[PDB]
Write a protein that binds this ligand. Sequence first.
Ligand code: SRM
Ligand code: SF4
Ligand code: CL
Length: 546
Amino acid sequence: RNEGQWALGHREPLNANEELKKAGNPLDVRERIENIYAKQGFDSIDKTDLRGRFRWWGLYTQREQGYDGTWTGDDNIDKLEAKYFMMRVRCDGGALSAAALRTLGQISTEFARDTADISDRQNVQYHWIEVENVPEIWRRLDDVGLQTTEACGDCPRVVLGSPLAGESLDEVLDPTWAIEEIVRRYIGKPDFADLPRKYKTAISGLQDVAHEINDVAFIGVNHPEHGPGLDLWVGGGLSTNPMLAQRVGAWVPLGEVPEVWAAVTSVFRDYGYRRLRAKARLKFLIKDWGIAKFREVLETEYLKRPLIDGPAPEPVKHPIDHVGVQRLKNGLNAVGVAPIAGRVSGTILTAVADLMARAGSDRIRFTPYQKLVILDIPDALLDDLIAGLDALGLQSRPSHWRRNLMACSGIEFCKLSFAETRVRAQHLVPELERRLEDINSQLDVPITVNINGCPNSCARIQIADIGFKGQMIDDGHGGSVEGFQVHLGGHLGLDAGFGRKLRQHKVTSDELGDYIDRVVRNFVKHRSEGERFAQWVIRAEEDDLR
Ligand code: SRM
Ligand code: SF4
Ligand SMILES: [Cl-]
């Protein structure tokens, strides 16, 4: 029925988005940036470059100051669009050298007003960036192996990796090689530069990469016959319409991973919907077809061969965030630290680089939970590193609250937010820490809290014990305020399922601490012994959850 699908011959633009991509490879702008725009400034920029083609280089326009949730909407673009950019650095597998981390630090301090926030896909993002500076940055970034290619846009985003790839005592294998090949073969090249939408990938020999909600995932497992390799998952995403990615039923040896990845991405390009902008993502195609039909098309049209059947690995009970100290195959140590919802700074990143040098380490990783871990810390030097990290506010022994909270960017910089999230979190974690110290003794089990500024679910609303979806609400009728809809009891891993939404429920941004306190105290009262939060949410009365 013409859903825009390329492989049915229905190859015509059905959107303004699908139409600007018809004007040649979007990645071409790079020349127009270095030739034209970086000299004339923001006003020279074509609106189709500005609001579309820029993304293929991780340049997203940032939110003008002073506008609250009232103004958020597709109709107000010109007002909400400031003369500054968010810039997103692509860090496949989170993996950086000390030198690269220092460069990141200096870029931020000098060009981004010292803004630097670790995203929950292992990237850093800068803000307050002016086009004038973008070539200069690209040049320093490239001088340490980093790029912004396809960091935003209708194309493959960062490939996620285990923050302990190659050093974990519990990894089935180290598939870093696959991630590295995928970047080298496919990233930056025409074949996958124009997809139905954004495309998210996760590859790891641990389940530490939130795979269940990626478009495609290769997660380690021991085939009883064939040994260590990767189980293939497909069809994931959480926005307004959440859906768990599902097992293809396949085992893939490490050597064939880049190949198979290409084939899945190729099906997306050729058979993904390109009609409705909010019905374009792979999860939908997978909902319609079913896995059997998809596996068939992958094997017969693209691979020209069967995939080997394989098992699923035992879903983990608790998630793996790698926070704290752990022993490595090196014999050395890894140390994970927890900022508050990814918020650091140029000064801090540079500070960490010097601590790394003092400790003799040249490897650090960003985390899919907005955290960072440093590898190759010998025992002698461990204590000194930990203390230095604390003095910068990066705790290897954080409280539950600081450890387990995530938030998106929110109204501080984002054009689609109704509420403030990243700054709120900076005050909220401490509040919770002291306000519930009272009860901390009892909390043998962690309560994950995710604060999102709108329904897009960037900080993963539906998979938190306490998820918050920012929206506009009303009180006294002479005031519509910023507040949150509440999702309770979401989780991945064993029996992954989304959180339940509450009936007539709005929590104002001032009440977040009150509400969390209330509910968590109710949790420790009406509680079973050894019971997780997501389980107690099945049964307690609806009054106990408000
Ligand atoms: C930074 C980050 C949040 C964070 O603090 O971690 C983030 C923030 C933004 N996301 Fe994202 N998303 C981020 C992870 C995600 C995730 C989570 C994930 O991948 O695990 C999701 C949910 C999972 C998913 O994609 O299904 C997510 C779903 C969105 C949405 C919803 C899209 C959709 O499929 O309908 C938008 C909007 C869109 O694409 O149209 C989007 C849009 C955005 C934009 C670019 C807003 C915009 O379009 O103007 C945000 C950046 C604005 C700014 O100035 O900061 N981003 N966003 C994460 C970036 C990681 C990265 O390096 O790529
Ligand atoms: S969830 Fe919405 S408000 Fe938060 S960063 Fe993502 S797009 Fe912006
Ligand atoms: Cl995103």
